[PDB]
Every structure is written in structure tokens, then in C-alpha cells.
């Protein structure tokens, strides 16, 4: 049997990043705001997590633990900590160097294994190597006890430099460091659990066993939901220096650390069984690809140093953990099967990725069609590329259900699948061209019909001339070799030209109430400004670049197969990655465009408060409209302006509270659009104030 239950990995990830996704769409849709997520955070970080730790360490048997694994992971984490710390000490701004050295190693060493790592390890190693579930509750607290103190010492040194007074105490900063380390629920709950394990004999009392199980089982889902709740509105556009340091930190989290852990395990472990040693090394690798634990974000926000870099890094690393961990575990278990089960495995992962991406794509197309935003040219081409992605994702499903079974319709399904995939590649090219045209000249008369017929016909011509030449080889399971070298040649030439088209573009990249059209010209100006938006050129650029990433990966795959024509144990990674991306592009498209915020007594009391102690305040200054030609309401305020004023005054805690309060004010007959065209939102629109 395989060292791990690989077939159970994808649902578990689908659970984890499923629950997180729920939380995100709960936070963005104002179902659970930022203030209201504090209660969930306190519950999961004060009651659920300490009960899980206590229950899972009291029963733990300290006499049957492979300490070599813990030593190896601790050595690897310490090495990454030291390397990052010394590198920051050498090259960084001298003003905040200590800060950049007191948080960056913590970002690159800790892991989100309690909430986002434990479900995956449980799914992988529960019916094969259950003892692997103990190390999650040992490595994380120990590494939190032997690395966090050094980082916090550095942060307290930076705070000392913030004051730079006559205080020269060297023990005070260290004491505060270990005090802030010891004031963490994880550390002292670990200590209490160990003490009670020593007191008892690994027999949790029956009186408290049910309480502990009930309060600990409700951690994983709740913790993931809270993580999703805090993971909305954090990531922001960064300076190029911030971009490159984020790249380096994320790479040091999911590239340096896993390799270091696997090397140390294959260096220290003395296990007689080769299979056990290989599985242990695989576990060491898969333990380091875990995302950055959100504890680094709260540490940064407590010290108030690099809050944006640390929070955005944790947010991005949470995304990047999923595909990396999936491909890592699959590639790690790949050299354990014959090439024929290898082909079945790659087909099955393609089918799973295809079903889930198809659901996401159908959803995103639902937003596109019911939002009527596809009329604009960029969104028209995005919808066209998205329906092409839906066609390829469904064609893969039908192909796996018809591979080598019905040769009669195999020609038809192959034609549909690869015509749609070539359409996706060429449509990435056409998207690049469309943003090129938008940047070059505005208000052009070029039809979209020519672009559409090209993007759906050149793939059709390619597949037709591919079918005409050669013969059908209805024996290979994979679709890429249904025809042979000819098919790979066509798939390489169209893929090549697609990336040249993409790269060429990329490189160069009075009144009181409602007023009449003359007296409400500012509303028309705001409507024109809004029409100037709703394009999201940066969003399209991001989609195109992330698509070009997989386009280049598949180009490298086809060139390697054509020229070398030798597997060499490296080509398996290439085929797996190309099969992953070809039908996982739906996830990317859903992530960028499939999700967006665009698409009585209590309210009376709130309106009374606002009109009692806040109507006549400095908001009167912030509410004003300039003369719209000859006449104006002179009582119109921007939604963002009122939100900012409410935040600064203190009636709201974040933007969500401000927008909900404004929604209540609107429902209370006080706030309304100057022309009633729209409804309260945190965007630049003038709103009249009535009375």
C-alpha cells in the first residue's frame, strides 16, 4: 500500500479551503463584520485551542515518540530562522533592521498546522501511520518556544531604539520577550498538559473527557472560518520592493523550509525500514509546505511593525500553500506506482480538479450573465475565455468517462476538449491584445466579432489539420498523446504563438431635493467617472499573467518532450503540472473574477442618535455640493467621505460598520442618492442628505 492515503487529500483540502472560503464570503458580504469576528477569534483562541491542546497532550505517550523527527524539524526551522535573521541584519534599512529581523524569521518559521495542517495530516496519515498525528502538537509549540523568544527579543530591541533613552537594561528586554512568549495560550497550555500527563497515567477523567471533546472538536472548522474572516481586506497593492521581499519570504516559507526539513530527516533518521524512512521524509516535506500561521500577523499588529507586509504575506501564503502542497504530495508519492497506475492517478486528479473547477466556472459565468457586465469589451472577452474554460473542464470529465471505452465518440470528445483548450490559450493571447488596444487608443471602433471568430476558429482549424494528418491511437489514457508526436507539435506551436502574443503586449504595458439634469450635472459627472471604472485593467493584467505562468509551464513541457523525448524521472513532474494547470485555470479565473462585492425600531433609534448628537457636527463641513451650473442641492456627500468621517469620529470600528450604519440611515429616510440612481455604498458617489 502507499505510504499515505493520497486519494483522500483533495477532499480534505477542499474542506479546509472550502470552510475558509465561506468565512471570506461571510466577511466581504458584511454577514459577519470585523468587530463581530472578534468574538469568534476569542472563542477559538482562548477556549477551543487550549482545550484541543490539553486533551491531545494529556493522553500523549511521551515514551513512544520518535524524537529524531522533532530534532530534524527543529534544526531546520532554527536554520531558516538564523539565515533569514542574519540576511536581514546584513542588508536592510538600519532604522528598522531589528524590526525586519524580529518578524521576518517568525514569518518564515511558524506554520498554520493546528488548524490548516492537522486536517490534511489526518486525512493522509490516519489509517497507515497514525503516530504521525502526534508531532503536530509537539513541533509547533516547541518551535514557538525556541524561536519566538529570539524574534521578540529583536522586536523589543527595536522598541528600545524607538525610545533610545538612558535605559541600558539588557535583562528587561529579554524578560519582556519571554513574558510575551509565555503569555501565549499555546505555551502554558502545553506546560499544563504535560504536567497533567505526568500526574495522571494518560487516562483523562470520564467527567471531563466529554467536555474536552466537545470544546476541542469545534476548533478546526471554527478556526478556519475565523481565518477566512480575517483574510478579507488585508492584501493591498504593494511597492515593488515590498513585492520582491514578499516573493523572497514566501519562497523561504514553502521552498527553503520543506527541502531543509526533508534533508535533515534523511540525514538524522536511523530507521531500519526503508519504507518507514521514506514515509517519514515525505511527512517532513509536507510539514514545511504549511502556510504561515496567523499568529505572526497578530504579533506584528501588537508590535505595530510591518503590519502590511506580515498580514499580506500570511494572506498570500495561505493561497500558495494549497497547490504547492497538493503537487508536492502527489509528486512525492509518484515514484511508488507503475506508469500505468501513474496515468490513472494523473487522470483522476485531472477529473477531481475538473469537477471542482467546473462548478466554480458555472458559478462565475452566472455572475457574468446575471450582472449584464459582459457588454463591455474586456468583460466580453473574459466571458468568452471563461466559457472556453468551462468547455475544457467539462470535456475532461466526459473524456475520463469515455477514455478507451467508446472509440466512436472518442474523436468527438477529443476534438471538443482540445479545441476548447487551444481556445483558452489563444484567448489569453487575445486578452493581451485587448488590453494592449485599450492602453493604446480609447474609444476605438474595432469589432469584437473578428476577435471572437478568430479565437474560436484558429483552434478549430488547428484541431482539423491535426485530425487530418496521422491516425487515431485509441490506447493511450492521457489525452495529450491520443494522436502522437503530431498532436504534441500542434499543441506546441499554438502554445508558443500564444505566449509571443501575450509577451509582446505585456512588455509594452438653491435646490434641496433631486435636481434637474442641468442642476444635477455633478451626478452626471460621477456617473461618467463610474463608467470610466468597471473595467479593472489591473485585474485583467493579473489574470493574464497568472495564465501565462501555466502557458510557459506547458510550453516547457512540450519542448522537453519533443527534443529530449526521455522521461528521466523529471518529465513526470512536467506532465502532472501541465495536467493540473490545463483544468485548474478555472480556479484562477474564479478567484479573480468569480468573487466580487459588486455582485424598524432599532433603525429609528440609530437615526435618532445620528440626528441628535451627530447631524450638526463637523459632518456639516464634509457635506457640500458645488454649484451645478446654476443650481445645486449643496447637501451631497461622497460615500467614502462619510465612511471616513464616521470612522474618524468613532461611531464605527471599520468600513463594514460604517457602511452598515449608512444602510440603516438610508432605510431611516435620511441618506439617499442625489438622483436616487443607486444605493449607499463605500464608493465615490454624491448622496443628498434630505433634512
Ligand X SMILES: CC(C)CCC[C@@H](C)[C@H]1CC[C@H]2[C@@H]3CC=C4C[C@@H](OC(=O)CCC(=O)O)CC[C@]4(C)[C@H]3CC[C@]12C
Ligand Y SMILES: CCCCCCCCCCCCCCCCCC(=O)OC[C@H](COP(=O)(O)OC[C@H](N)C(=O)O)OC(=O)CCCCCCCCCCCCCCCCC
| Residue 32 is a binding residue for its own copies (CB under 8 A) | yes
| Residue 286 is a binding residue for ligand X (CB under 6 A) | no
Say if residues 593 and 601 touch (Cβ distance below 8 Å): no
Q: Considering only residues 317-376, where is the footprint of its own copies by CB under 8 A?
A: 352, 355-356
Q: How far apart are CA 194 and CA 62, in angstroms?
A: 9
The helix (H) or strand (E) run that includes residue 638 is strand 637-638
Q: Running DSSP on this structure, what letter comes out for residue 675?
A: S
Considering the complex, state which of residue 244 and residue 461 has its C-beta at the smaller distance from ligand 3PE. 244
Residue selected from 102, 105, 117, 119 as contacting its own copies according to rule CB under 8 A? 119
Neighbours of 595 (CB within 10 A): 15
- The DSSP secondary structure of 399-419, one letter per residue, reads HHTTTTT-HHHHHHHHHHHHH
Angle, CA 425 vertex, CA 420 and CA 428 arms, to 5°: 120
Residue selected from 49, 250, 463, 495 as contacting ligand 3PE according to rule CB under 6 A? 250
Considering the complex, state which of residue 160 and residue 351 has its C-beta at the smaller distance from ligand X. 351
Residue 459's binding partner, choosing from ligand 3PE, ligand PC1, ligand X, none, with beta-carbon cut-off 5 to 8 A by kind? none
Residue 185's binding partner, choosing from ligand X, ligand PC1, ligand Y, none, with beta-carbon cut-off 5 to 8 A by kind? ligand Y
Residue selected from 51, 227, 256, 652 as contacting ligand 3PE according to rule CB under 6 A? 256
SS (H, E, C) 190-206: HHHHHHHHHHCCCCCCH
Q: Considering only residues 510-549, where is the footprint of ligand 3PE by CB under 6 A?
A: 538-539, 542, 546, 549
| Residue 186 is a binding residue for its own copies (CB under 8 A) | no
Per-position x/- string for 229-268, each x denoting binding to ligand X as judged by CB under 6 A, each - no binding: --xxx-x---------------------------------
Say if residues 328 and 19 touch (Cβ distance below 8 Å): no
Q: How far apart are CA 196 and CA 211, in angstroms?
A: 16
Say if residues 413 and 399 touch (Cβ distance below 8 Å): yes
Residue 348's binding partner, choosing from ligand PC1, ligand 3PE, ligand Y, none, with beta-carbon cut-off 5 to 8 A by kind? ligand PC1
The helix (H) or strand (E) run that includes residue 10 is helix 9-28
Per-position x/- string for 343-372, each x denoting binding to ligand PC1 as judged by CB under 6 A, each - no binding: -----x--xx--xx--x---x---------
Considering the complex, state which of residue 299 and residue 587 has its C-beta at the smaller distance from ligand X. 587
Q: How far apart are CA 105 and CA 93, in angstroms?
A: 16
Q: Considering only residues 298-337, where is the footprint of ligand 3PE by CB under 6 A?
A: 316, 320, 323-324, 327
Burial of 94 (0-12, 13-18, 19+ CB in 10 A): exposed
Residue selected from 4, 37, 44, 51 as contacting ligand Y according to rule CB under 6 A? 51
Q: Considering only residues 325-354, where is the footprint of ligand X by CB under 6 A?
A: 326, 353
| Residue 231 is a binding residue for ligand 3PE (CB under 6 A) | no
Per-position x/- string for 577-606, each x denoting binding to ligand X as judged by CB under 6 A, each - no binding: ---xx--x--xx--xx--x-----------
Per-position x/- string for 118-157, each x denoting binding to ligand 3PE as judged by CB under 6 A, each - no binding: ----------------------------------------
CA 545 to chain centre: 16
Say if residues 82 and 263 touch (Cβ distance below 8 Å): no
| Residue 22 is a binding residue for ligand PC1 (CB under 6 A) | no
Which residues are CB-neighbours of 507 under 8 A, at least 6 positions away?
none
Q: Considering only residues 161-190, where is the footprint of ligand Y by CB under 6 A?
A: 183, 185
479 vs 84, 391, 454, 474, CA distance in Å? Answer: 44, 15, 24, 10
538 vs 237, 309, 385, 437, 576, CA distance in Å? Answer: 10, 20, 17, 15, 30
Residue 499's binding partner, choosing from ligand X, ligand 3PE, ligand Y, none, with beta-carbon cut-off 5 to 8 A by kind? none
**In terms of Cα–Cα distance, which of 527, 509, 507 is closest to 517?**
527
Supply the angle between the helices 9-28 and 307-333 in degrees, to the nearest 10.
Answer: 160
Q: Where are the alpha helices (DSSP H) in 515-570?
A: 521-532, 537-563
Considering the complex, state which of residue 197 and residue 479 has its C-beta at the smaller distance from ligand Y. 197
Q: Considering only residues 69-98, where is the footprint of ligand 3PE by CB under 6 A?
A: 83-84, 87-88, 91-93
Residue 29's binding partner, choosing from ligand X, ligand Y, ligand PC1, none, with beta-carbon cut-off 5 to 8 A by kind? ligand Y
Supply the angle between the helices 295-303 and 148-163 in degrees, to the nearest 10.
Answer: 20
Residues that bind ligand Y (CB under 6 A): 14, 17-18, 21-22, 25-26, 29-31, 46-47, 50-51, 54, 183, 185, 192, 205, 207-208, 211, 356, 359-360, 363
Residues that bind ligand X (CB under 6 A): 13-14, 17, 21, 24, 28, 231-233, 235, 315, 319-320, 322-323, 326, 353, 542, 546, 580-581, 584, 587-588, 591-592, 595
Amino acid at each position: 500500500p502507499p505510504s499515505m492515503s493520497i486519494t483522500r487529500l483533495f477532499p480534505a483540502l477542499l474542506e479546509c479551503f472550502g470552510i475558509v472560503l465561506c468565512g471570506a464570503i461571510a466577511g466581504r458580504a458584511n454577514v459577519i463584520t470585523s468587530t463581530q469576528a472578534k468574538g469568534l477569534g476569542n472563542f477559538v483562541s482562548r477556549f477551543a485551542l487550549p482545550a484541543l491542546l490539553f486533551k491531545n497532550m494529556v493522553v500523549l505517550n511521551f515514551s513512544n515518540v520518535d524524537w529524531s523527527f522533532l530534532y530534524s524539524i527543529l534544526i531546520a526551522k532554527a536554520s531558516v530562522f538564523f539565515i533569514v535573521c542574519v540576511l536581514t541584519l546584513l542588508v536592510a534599512s538600519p532604522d528598522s533592521r531589528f524590526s525586519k529581523a524580529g518578524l521576518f524569521p517568525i514569518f518564515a518559521t511558524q506554520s498554520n498546522d493546528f488548524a490548516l495542517g492537522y486536517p490534511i495530516v489526518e486525512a493522509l496519515y490516519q489509517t497507515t501511520y497514525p503516530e504521525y498525528l502526534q508531532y503536530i502538537y509537539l513541533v509547533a509549540p516547541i518551535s514557538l518556544m525556541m524561536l519566538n523568544p529570539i524574534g521578540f527579543i529583536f522586536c523589543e530591541i527595536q522598541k528600545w531604539k524607538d525610545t533610545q533613552n538612558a535605559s541600558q537594561n539588557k535583562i528587561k528586554i529579554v524578560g519582556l520577550g519571554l513574558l510575551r512568549v509565555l503569555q501565549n495560550p499555546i505555551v502554558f497550555m502545553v506546560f499544563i498538559g504535560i504536567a497533567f500527563n505526568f500526574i495522571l497515567d494518560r487516562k483523562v477523567p470520564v467527567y471531563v473527557e466529554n467536555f474536552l471533546d466537545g470544546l476541542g472538536n469545534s476548533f478546526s472548522g471554527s478556526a478556519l472560518f475565523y481565518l477566512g474572516l480575517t483574510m478579507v481586506g488585508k492584501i493591498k497593492r504593494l511597492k515593488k520592493s515590498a513585492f520582491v521581499v514578499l516573493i523572497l519570504l514566501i519562497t523561504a516559507k514553502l521552498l527553503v523550509l520543506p527541502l531543509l526539513c526533508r534533508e535533515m530527516v534523511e540525514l538524522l533518521d536511523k530507521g531500519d525500514s526503508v519504507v518507514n524512512h521514506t514515509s517519514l521524509s515525505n511527512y517532513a516535506f509536507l510539514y514545511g509546505v504549511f502556510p504561515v500561521a496567523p499568529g505572526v500577523a497578530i504579533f506584528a499588529t501588537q508590535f505595530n511593525m510591518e503590519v502590511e507586509i506580515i498580514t499580506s504575506g500570511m494572506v498570500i501564503s495561505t493561497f500558495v500553500s494549497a497547490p504547492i502542497m497538493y503537487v508536492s504530495a502527489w509528486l512525492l508519492t509518484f515514484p511508488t506506482m507503475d506508469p500505468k497506475p501513474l496515468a490513472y492517478a494523473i487522470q483522476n486528479v485531472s477529473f477531481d480538479i475538473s469537477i471542482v473547477s467546473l462548478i466554480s466556472l458555472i458559478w462565475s459565468l452566472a455572475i457574468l450573465l446575471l450582472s449584464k457586465k459582459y457588454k463591455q469589451l474586456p468583460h466580453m472577452l473574459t466571458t468568452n475565455l471563461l466559457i472556453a474554460q468551462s468547455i475544457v473542464c467539462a470535456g475532461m470529465m466526459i473524456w475520463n468517462f469515455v477514455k478507451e471505452k467508446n472509440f466512436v465518440g472518442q474523436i468527438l470528445v477529443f476534438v471538443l476538449l482540445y479545441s476548447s483548450l487551444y481556445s483558452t490559450y489563444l484567448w489569453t493571447g487575445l486578452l493581451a491584445i485587448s488590453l494592449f488596444l485599450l492602453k493604446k487608443r480609447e474609444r476605438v471602433q474595432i469589432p469584437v466579432g473578428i476577435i471572437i471568430i478568430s479565437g474560436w476558429g484558429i483552434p478549430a482549424l488547428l484541431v482539423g489539420v491535426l485530425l487530418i494528418t496521422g491516425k487515431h491511437n485509441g490506447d493511450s489514457i492521457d489525452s495529450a498523446f491520443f494522436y502522437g508526436k503530431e498532436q504534441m507539435i500542434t499543441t506546441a506551436v499554438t502554445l508558443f504563438c500564444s505566449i509571443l502574443i501575450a509577451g509582446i503586449s505585456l512588455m509594452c504595458m438653491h435646490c434641496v431635493s433631486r435636481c434637474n439634469s442641468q442642476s444635477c450635472i455633478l451626478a452626471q459627472e460621477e456617473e461618467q467617472y463610474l463608467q470610466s471604472g468597471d473595467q479593472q485593467l489591473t485585474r485583467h493584467v493579473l489574470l493574464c499573467l497568472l495564465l501565462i505562468i501555466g502557458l510557459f509551464a506547458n510550453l516547457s513541457s512540450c519542448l522537453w518532450w519533443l527534443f529530449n523525448q526521455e522521461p528521466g524521472r523529471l518529465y513526470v513532474e512536467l506532465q502532472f503540472f501541465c495536467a493540473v494547470f490545463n483544468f485548474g485555470q478555472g480556479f484562477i479565473s474564479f478567484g479573480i473574477f468569480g468573487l466580487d462585492k459588486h455582485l424598524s425600531e432599532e433603525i429609528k433609534m440609530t437615526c435618532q442618535q445620528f440626528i441628535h448628537y451627530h447631524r450638526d457636527l463637523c459632518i456639516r463641513n464634509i457635506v457640500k455640493e458645488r454649484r451645478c451650473g446654476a443650481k445645486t442641492s449643496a447637501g451631497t456627500f461622497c460615500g467614502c467621505d462619510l465612511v471616513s468621517w464616521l470612522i474618524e469620529v468613532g461611531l464605527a470600528s471599520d468600513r463594514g460598520e460604517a457602511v452598515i450604519y449608512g444602510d440603516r440611515l438610508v432605510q431611516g429616510g435620511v441618506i439617499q442618492h442625489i438622483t436616487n440612481e443607486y444605493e449607499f455604498r463605500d464608493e465615490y458617489l454624491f448622496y443628498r442628505f434630505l433634512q
